Amino acid sequence: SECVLGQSKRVDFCGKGYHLMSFPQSAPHGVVFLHVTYVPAQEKNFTTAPAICHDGKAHFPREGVFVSNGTHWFVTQRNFYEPQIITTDNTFVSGNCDVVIGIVNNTVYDPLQPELD
Amino acid sequence: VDCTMYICGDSTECSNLLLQYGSFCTQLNRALTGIAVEQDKNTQEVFAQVKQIYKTPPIKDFGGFNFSQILPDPSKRSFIEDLLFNKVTLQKFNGLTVLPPLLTDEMIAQYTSALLAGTITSGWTFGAGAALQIPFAMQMAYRFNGIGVTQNVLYENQKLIANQFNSAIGKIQDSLSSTASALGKLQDVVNQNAQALNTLVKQLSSNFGAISSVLNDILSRLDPPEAEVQIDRLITGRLQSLQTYVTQQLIRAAEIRASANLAATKMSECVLGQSKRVDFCGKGYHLMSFPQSAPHGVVFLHVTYVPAQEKNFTTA
Amino acid sequence: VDCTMYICGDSTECSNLLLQYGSFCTQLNRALTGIAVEQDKNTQEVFAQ
Amino acid sequence: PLSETKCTLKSFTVEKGIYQTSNFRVQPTESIVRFPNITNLCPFGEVFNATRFASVYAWNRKRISNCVADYSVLYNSASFSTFKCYGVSPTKLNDLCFTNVYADSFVIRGDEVRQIAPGQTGKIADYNYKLPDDFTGCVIAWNSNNLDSYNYLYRNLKPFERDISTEIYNCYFPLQSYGFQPTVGYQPYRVVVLSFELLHAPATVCGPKKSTNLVKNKCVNFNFNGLTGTGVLTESNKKFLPFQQFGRDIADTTDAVRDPQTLEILDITPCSFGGVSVITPGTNTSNQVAVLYQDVNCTEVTGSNVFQTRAGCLIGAEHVNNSYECDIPIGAGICAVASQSIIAYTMSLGAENSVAYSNNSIAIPTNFTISVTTEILPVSMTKTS
Amino acid sequence: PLSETKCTLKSFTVEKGIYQTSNFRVQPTESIVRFPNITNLCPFGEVFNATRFASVYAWNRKRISNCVADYSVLYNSASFSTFKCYGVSPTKLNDLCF
C-alpha cells in the first residue's frame, strides 16, 4: 500500500537508499518486491559556511547549501553538485551578520542592479 | 531442556517406558531450539543496521553540544549504558541449560557506538549510502528546516539550544541514577522467564497419582510388572508439564519478536533519519535520536523540539 | 476462572486428590489475570492519548 | 561424530550449520553402599514361632528395632500360606532400611483370612481390624490349626483400632467365638502383618549388606541407606544440626547427606553432564567435523586440538587469530572451512573507518547510481484439514 | 488479609497493587433430607427365605417396589459368602433411592 501505490519517505523501509518506485511480483506462496532506489556516489569535499556577510546583513540559503572550492562561493542542493552564482533570488536575509558563528565574507549579486544600466 | 533427562533422570527403565510415546521429546526440543535461534535474529535485526563501524574524531567541536555522557569510554561502554546495566538485578542442574547469546555485550555496545558516531558526524546520509561529513550545527539546521522552522532560527539561537540539550542530558542521567523501576519493561521479561523455569523445576516434586515423587525410590522397592504403572503416571505428568512450558515459551517468544520488530523499525526510521510520524519518537517534533545498549534490550533517547510561551494575534 | 471450583465443585476429597497435581491451577489463574491486565492496558494505550 | 548427524536428521547429506546430536554424561563407577554399624540378627523366631497369640479382639502388636533383619530366610520358604507384600518387593527387602518394624499378630478363620487387606469389606474388616488407604509391609498368614485344633473370639472402627470391651449392646451381646476341630470354612489360620516406615527418621533395621568403603570428589553411584543416587561427593562449608539427616534445596533431589557410620556431612552434586554439538561445513563440501561440549571444562573429556571458550570446550577446530566474517555461529562472540581445517575465530562487525570531520568542511555527491533490491514476504500457508 | 497476601506471594514483603488471594463462599448449615412418605417395609425374606429356586434354565426373577427397604438386616449378617456389589458400596445402600 505504501511503496507500490505511492512513494514512502520512511528510511530503509523499501530499500537501501532513497525510494523512487517499487514493482511487485507474484510467487509460489508469497510476494517479491523489487524496489528501485537512488543512491549518491563519487562524493567530493568542499568548504562550507552557515551564512554570508553582505553590507551588514546575513544571507542564508533558500534551498541548498553554501559551498566553496577554495576560491569562490556557490550554492548547491544538498544532495547533488550543481553549483550556481550566489544571488538574491536564492538566498533570503535576516538580521545583522555579527551573531552567526562562522560567517564568511563574500559578495551577493542582485540581478536588478545591472538591468538598471 | 533435555526431555529424556528432565523426565526420567538417568533411569534406563524409565527411558524404555518413555520411548513408546512417539517423538514428543524431539518435537519439544525442536520448538525450543527454534525460539533459541530466533532470538539471535531479533538481536541482529535490531542492532546490525550499520555497514561499517564508524568512529568519532578526537577533536570534539560539535557546535557546543556535549556528547560525553553518551559516547563510549575506553574502559569497555558509555556512562548511560553503565547506569542501565546497573539498573537491573537479574541455572544448569537437571536437564536444563542456558545458552549464551551470539553477540557479547561488548559487540552490542560497539554497534550502539558505531551508530552514534555515524549519526553525530553524517546525519541522514550514512543510512542511505556513504557517510558525507557535515558540521553539526548545519545538520541541526537541516533538521530544524525539516520540522518546519527556518534555519536562521537555529544559527541565531545556537547557544541556547546547546545549553538546553546539555541540561536535558543531565536531567536524563539524574532521572536514571535516582528513580527506581526504570527498566521495568525488561525486569518484567526476566522475571517472567525465570518464574516459568522455576515452575518447571518445582513440578518435579509432584506424584500425579503415583506412590512417590522420586523415580529411583519406586524403582528400588517395587517389581517391574507393577513399577510400570507408577512410572507411567509420573511420565505422563512430567510430559504434560514440559509441554505446557514449551507452549507458553512459544507464545512469549512471539510477543518478544513483535517487540523487537517494533524496535528495529524505530531504529531504522528515527536514528538513521528524521521521522515525520506524530508521537512515534517522543512528544513534540522529532529532531534526532540516540540509541543506547541495555541488559536485554535497547533504550532510545529522542531529542525533540517543543514550542512554548505563545501569544495571541488577530488573523485573516 | 477458578480451578478448584470449576473442576472439583466444593468437594474436600476432590481437592485432596487434586493437590497432588502440582500447581497447574495457580499457573492457569496467573495466565488469565495476565491477559486481563493486558486487556486493561490496551484501552489505556489507545484512548489516553 | 558425524554419523550421529546423519542419524539425527534422517539423511545422508546435511547442509552447513551447527546441530544438537545428543548429550554426554561421565558414567559413574565402583558403586558404594553405606549402611549403619549395628549388625546383629533380629529375633523373628521369638515372633513367628509363638503359640499364645491373642484373639481378634485384643490382637497383639510388638515392635522391632536395633538389629539387622535377614528377610530372605523367611520369604523364600513353604512354611506360610499367604505371603503378600503391599508396595514392597519381597525379594528386595534386603536393601531397604526402615526406622521401626511393627509386627501385629492374631488368629482368625481360614475363610476370613482374605479380609486382612486395605479395600475389602466383611465382618472383621469392619468390626475388628482394618488397614488404611496406604500400604503395610507384608501380610504373612500360615495354617496353624494343627496346633490349634472357642478361646478365640471376635466381634465401623478405623484402621488400626482396638476394641477391648466385651459387653452386651434390645439386649444382645455381639461377640462370638471360633471352633477348633479338624472337621474347611472354619479352619483357623495364624496371621501376622509387618508394617514399616520410609524416609521419616534415622533407620535401624535392614538386611545383610556390605557397607563398603567411601570415596570422595568423584562421580560415583551410591546406595546410601536405601537412598540411591549418583553424583560427585564434596566437602561442605555448611553445617547441619543435631537433628538433620540430609538436606536439599528444591525439587526433592537430595543435595547433602550425613554419614550413618561417621556422622559426617558431605555435599552431593550432579557430575559433569551437558549437550554435544557438531559444527559441520556441509557434507557436499567435505567430511571433516568439529565438536563442542556445552558448558564443560574439558578437564573432563578426543582432544587433538582443544580451545576453551565461553560456550564450552571446542575440539576439532583451530583458534585462528585474525577476525573474518561469521560463517557458522557458536556463541559468546565465537563463529566458525578454511585451509584444509576448521577454524574458530572472533567474528568482527565490519570495516572500521572514521569519517574526516571538520567544523568547516562538507561532502556532496557528484554522480549517482540507481539500484533494484529484492525483498521476499510470505503471505499464505497451506490449508490443511 | 495481609497474611494471606504474604502467603499467596511466597514472600514476607509485597509491593503495591491489588492481588487475588482466594475465593470465598458462605458455608451451608443444617442439611436437609427429603424421602417419600410411604414407609412400609417389604419382604426381602419372601425372596431369600425360599427353597423353590428354579434351575439355571428358567432362573426366576421378581420385582420389588413400593416400600421403604431394609438392607442392613441382610448385609450385616454372616449368612452369605460372596457379597460383591458392582458400582455401589453396600454400607451406602441405606441412603440411595431406586
- Whether A contacts C, i.e. 3 or more CB pairs less than 8 A apart, is no
CB A103 within 8 A of CB A57: no
Q: How far apart are CA C17 and CA C25, in angstroms?
A: 13
**Placement of cell 545458552 in the chain:** B99
Q: How was this structure determined?
A: cryo-EM
**B220 phi and psi, to 5 degrees?**
-75, -50
> From E27, which residue of chain C is nearest by alpha-carbon distance?
C10
**D292 phi and psi, to 5 degrees?**
-135, 130
Strand partners for A48: A67
Q: How many residues does chain D have?
A: 385
How far lies B156's CA from each of A99, B147, D258, in Å? 6, 17, 81
Closest-CA distance, A117 to chain B, in angstroms, reads 34
- Angle of the B79-86 helix axis to the B105-121 helix axis, nearest 10: 140
How far lies D128's CA from each of D55, D132, D162, D163, D164, in Å? 10, 14, 7, 7, 10
Q: Quick one: which H or E segment has residue B158?
A: helix B158-178
Q: How far apart are CA D242 and CA B123, in angstroms?
A: 72
Dig out the grid coordinates for D377 from the structure.
514476504
**E75 phi and psi, to 5 degrees?**
-65, -40
Closest CA to D63 of D82, D91, D44: D44
Given B129, B152, B268, which is nearest A60 (Cβ)? B152
Given C22, C31, C49, which is nearest B203 (Cβ)? C22
Contacts of A51 in chain D (CB under 8 A): none
**D123 phi and psi, to 5 degrees?**
-80, -60
Name the residue type at position E59. Answer: W
Closest-CA distance, D265 to chain E, in angstroms, reads 30
Q: How far apart are CA D153 and CA D175, in angstroms?
A: 7
Dig out the grid coordinates for B21 from the structure.
510415546
Strand partners for D220: D29, D231
Mutate to test the interface with B, among D10, D98, D355, D370 (most CBs of B within 10 A): D355
Dig out the grid coordinates for B28 from the structure.
519439544
CB atoms within 10 A of CB B26: 12
Burial tier of B59 (Cβ tally within 10 Å: 0-12, 13-18, 19+): exposed
Dig out the grid coordinates for B212 from the structure.
512417590
Strand partners for A47: A68, D361
Closest-CA distance, E69 to chain D, in angstroms, reads 21
Q: Give chain E's end-to-end CA distance (angstroms, integer).
A: 47
Assign A96 to helix, strand or coil.
Answer: coil
CA A85, A91, A97, A102 torsion-angle sign: negative
CB atoms within 10 A of CB E12: 7
Strands (E), D281-342: 290-294, 306-309, 312-315, 318-319, 329-331, 334-335
Contacts of D99 (CB under 8 A, 6+ apart): D196, D197, D198, D200, D201, D202, D203, D204, D205
CB D63 within 8 A of CB D195: no
Q: How far is CA B13 from the centre of its chain?
A: 43
Q: How far apart are CA B94 and CA B4, in angstroms?
A: 11
Mutate to test the interface with D, among A10, A33, A66 (most CBs of D within 10 A): A33
Mutate to test the interface with C, among E20, E21, E26, E27 (most CBs of C within 10 A): E20
- Residue A45 to residue D363, Cβ atoms within 8 A: yes
Closest CA to D108 of D57, D74, D62: D57
Q: How far apart are CA D238 and CA D269, in angstroms?
A: 14
CB A6 within 8 A of CB A20: no
Dig out the grid coordinates for D383 from the structure.
490449508
Q: How far apart are CA D293 and CA D232, in angstroms?
A: 19
- Residue B207 to residue C31, Cβ atoms within 8 A: no
Q: How far apart are CA A33 and CA A24, in angstroms?
A: 5
Closest CA to B39 of B108, B114, B103: B103
Buried (b) or exposed (e) across A56-84, using 16+ Cβ within 10 A?
eebbbbeebbbbbeeeebbbbebbebebe
Contacts of E23 in chain C (CB under 8 A): 2, 4-5
**Beta strands A18-26; A30-48: pairing state:** antiparallel
Mutate to test the interface with B, among C27, C35, C45 (most CBs of B within 10 A): C27
CB atoms within 10 A of CB D113: 21
Q: How far apart are CA C26 and CA C32, in angstroms?
A: 10
Residues of C with CB under 8 A from a CB of B: 20-24, 27, 31, 49
**Beta strands A73-77; A65-68: pairing state:** antiparallel
- Residue B203 to residue C21, Cβ atoms within 8 A: no
Interface B:D, Cβ pairs < 8 A: 127
Contacts of B300 (CB under 8 A, 6+ apart): B266, B267, B270, B271, B281, B289, B290, B291, B292
Q: How far apart are CA B107 and CA B103, in angstroms?
A: 6
**Beta strands D246-247; D256-258: pairing state:** antiparallel
**D39 phi and psi, to 5 degrees?**
-130, 85
Closest-CA distance, B268 to chain A, in angstroms, reads 6
Assign B139 to helix, strand or coil.
Answer: helix
Is the minimum CB–CB distance between D375 and chain A shorter than 8 Å? yes
- Residue D251 to residue B94, Cβ atoms within 8 A: yes
Q: How far apart are CA D166 and CA D155, in angstroms?
A: 9
Alpha helices in B179-309 (DSSP H): 184-202, 215-220, 224-266
- Residue D123 to residue E90, Cβ atoms within 8 A: no
Is the minimum CB–CB distance between D355 and chain A shorter than 8 Å? no
Strand partners for D273: D25
Assign E74 to helix, strand or coil.
Answer: helix
Q: How many residues does chain C have?
A: 49
Q: How far apart are CA B245 and CA C23, in angstroms?
A: 13
Q: How far apart are CA B120 and CA B127, in angstroms?
A: 12
How far lies D211's CA from each of B133, B220, D124, D374, in Å? 81, 18, 44, 74
Dig out the grid coordinates for E77 from the structure.
449378617
CA D159, D164, D167, D172 torsion-angle sign: positive
Q: How far apart are CA B26 and CA B165, in angstroms?
A: 55
- Residue A41 to residue D365, Cβ atoms within 8 A: yes
Q: How far apart are CA A106 and CA B214, in angstroms?
A: 90
- Whether C contacts B, i.e. 3 or more CB pairs less than 8 A apart, is yes
- Residue D92 to residue B220, Cβ atoms within 8 A: yes
Q: How far apart are CA D238 and CA D251, in angstroms?
A: 20
Q: How far apart are CA E65 and CA C34, in angstroms?
A: 57
**B263 phi and psi, to 5 degrees?**
-70, -35
Given D361, D365, D378, which is nearest A42 (Cβ)? D365
CB atoms within 10 A of CB B285: 19
DSSP code per residue over B85-118 = HHT-----SSS---PPPSS-HHHHHHHHHHHHHH
Dig out the grid coordinates for D43 from the structure.
529375633
Given B102, B107, B133, which is nearest D349 (Cβ)? B107
Is the minimum CB–CB distance between B138 and chain A shorter than 8 Å? yes
Dig out the grid coordinates for A72 from the structure.
569562490
Name the residue type at position D376. Answer: I
Alpha helices in chain D (DSSP H): 3-8, 45-48, 124-127
> From B126, which residue of chain D is nearest by alpha-carbon distance?
D355
Dig out the grid coordinates for C29 from the structure.
489463574
Is the minimum CB–CB distance between B300 and chain A shorter than 8 Å? no
Q: How far apart are CA A113 and CA B14, in angstroms?
A: 101
- Residue B54 to residue D353, Cβ atoms within 8 A: yes
Q: How far apart are CA B285 and CA B144, in angstroms?
A: 9
- Residue B268 to residue A12, Cβ atoms within 8 A: yes
Q: Quick one: which H or E segment has residue B80?
A: helix B79-86
